[PDB]
Design a binder for this molecule. Structure first.
Ligand code: ERS
Ligand code: ERS
Ligand code: NA
Ligand code: NA
Lengths: 315, 315
């Protein structure tokens, strides 16, 4: 049972047929506008639920959340512990993506700031101790309070400060990482974390059980504290549609694999499949789970043996 | 009776507390998100109606327009000739403004593209010949067709291409300008128009009856074909809140002044007041009309004589 903390949002996603390069008073004429379910925690919970995992969504939203709640419950997500603001609306992410997948976005937190009033102890009282708590991008104070509570209650946690790493200080980042079962970042964020914390590579690896570093088109690295390193290439895409939520999808597939007993490489192969399915769609939760297509693309990228091992835990 | 053609939209307006200067994968954490009535033609019709003028809004919107319609009708705007799409949603403008009033925006046209199917002859059949047709930013094909129809039917028109000037070719711009009773642009746009058309200053002035060139904080120039030039400074602001729609407001106030019989300078003084009221609010139609406050600020900027002459034609 995975508890996913982080943002819950509505994503307003637009497509610019040009290149931001070519273009202060910027104006982009866009040819697509769609409104979809979002937030890092909603995205990850959705994917874990669709894949058959046991998952609870823990974050703050507005009263407008009813339909999103029904959507997620239909996919097996426990939404009992979503804090509903008395006054604020669910966060909104507004993003324009150009033909090269570059992005210009604005994020309005809304009810997300109230996540600092959530107590993981209440979740535990309701459903028991989760096997893993994901600490995703969120209200910063909530990110700290949740990490501290995980340590105090003895809950394994994944440090997943993607989008907030630029806003956090070195000390704040250090406080999010120590003792993590997993640290997730992309490659740029990893260099940034090292610069801001003042930690060396070895300093970090001595405080976590596993580093997971995504590399965009180059795939993903899984690095253990003893240096053992697994590199998994991407599942090659047939389209680049919209990059929003691809990292969330990787994490959800990887952690669902781990929850089902798969090893590190197989779990990262599953995560790579979910990631490409999101890259090939516009919303973050608009992809469909087709068991046969999953088995096929996993086999084409990684071999029939790996594919069979993975889908065996998804049927 | 003024017919206002151009865009009809919903504006989603956000505030970035920083400076865009300081920041491809841009992400702005914003501290305000509001949804307001917009579109250049809606903005200008709203202001003309609030000021007591006779005005008809002529553009394309979606079925979602009902509430907007009621809003405008309550302020005297004839919305009978708004084309309602069978399938498309009203256009959306999404904009983030930083602390120095710089802007990053995306525009989704939606139903705006259907404005090319509007015939001004049908408007004329319903309400008679308008005294002036404003040709505001719109579906480009509609801008051309409307201008051509004004010439054919003998309707005075104002060339007001603003936001579309970068996307139109020199030839397309030339076709919008010849024979205009008024040409409206800002100063940057005037330089751009001269460059793209290949016309000199004198070439343009021989084809229009009046040039109106807004200068931002430096006010506005009104230039007749014989060179006679009136410069009107701004009504000084007490805040810079959001620059969206300020130009639309200037044009509406100016043209309402002209429709009420005021001279060029007095009309531009009125336009400058409406402009500052929009600069001091967030939406484009969120300002309120306070007769006494209007008279006071006009007198402080331009003297009691001018103020009294202007408010004499208002309520
Ligand atoms: O993973 C994709 C999902 O991320 C969701 N999202 C997009 N921005 C998000 C965010 N912010 C961005 C703005 N900000 C910042 C900080 C430092 C420098 C610059 C900006 C604070 C952190 N925080 C949480 N979720 C976010 C979206 O809803 C989508 O579904
Ligand atoms: O005056 C303020 C009002 O302008 C409304 N608006 C904002 N963009 C608008 C627009 N576009 C922008 C995008 N595009 C372009 C063209 C050249 C270079 C780059 C992009 C086509 C022209 N066209 C009509 N109305 C617009 C808004 O709804 C607000 O209420
Ligand atoms: Na996507
Ligand atoms: Na404004």
């Amino acid at each position: 049972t995975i508890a996913v903390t982080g943002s819950i949002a509505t994503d307003h996603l637009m497509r610019f047929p040009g290149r931001f390069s070519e273009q202060v008073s910027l104006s982009f004429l866009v040819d697509d506008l769609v409104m979809h379910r979002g937030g890092v925690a909603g995205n990850m919970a959705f994917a874990i639920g669709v894949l058959g995992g046991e998952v609870a969504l823990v974050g703050a939203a507005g009263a407008d959340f009813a339909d999103y709640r029904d959507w997620l419950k239909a996919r097996g997500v426990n939404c009992d512990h979503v804090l509903i603001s008395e006054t604020a609306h669910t966060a909104r992410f507004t993003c324009t993506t150009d033909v090269d997948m570059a992005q210009i976005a604005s994020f309005y937190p809304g009810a997300m700031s109230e996540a600092r009033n959530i107590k993981l102890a209440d979740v535990v009282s309701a459903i028991g101790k989760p096997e893993l708590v994901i600490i995703g991008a969120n209200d910063p104070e909530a990110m700290f309070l949740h990490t501290e509570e995980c340590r105090k209650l003895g809950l394994a946690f994944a440090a997943d400060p993607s989008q907030q790493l630029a806003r956090l200080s070195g000390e704040e980042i250090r406080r999010l990482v120590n003792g993590a079962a997993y640290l997730f970042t992309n490659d740029y964020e990893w260099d940034l974390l090292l610069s801001k914390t003042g930690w060396s590579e070895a300093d970090v690896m001595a405080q976590i059980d596993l580093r997971v570093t995504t590399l965009g088109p180059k795939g993903v690295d899984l690095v253990e504290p003893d240096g053992t390193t697994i590199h998994v290439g991407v599942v090659p895409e047939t389209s680049q549609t919209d990059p929003t939520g691809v990292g969330d999808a990787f994490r959800a597939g990887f952690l669902t694999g781990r929850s089902a007993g798969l090893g590190l490489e197989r779990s990262a192969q599953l995560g790579s499949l979910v990631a490409v399915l999101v890259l090939e769609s516009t919303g973050t939760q608009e992809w469909q789970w087709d068991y046969e297509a999953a088995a096929s693309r996993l086999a084409g990228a990684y071999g029939e043996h790996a594919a069979a091992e993975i889908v065996a835990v998804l049927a």
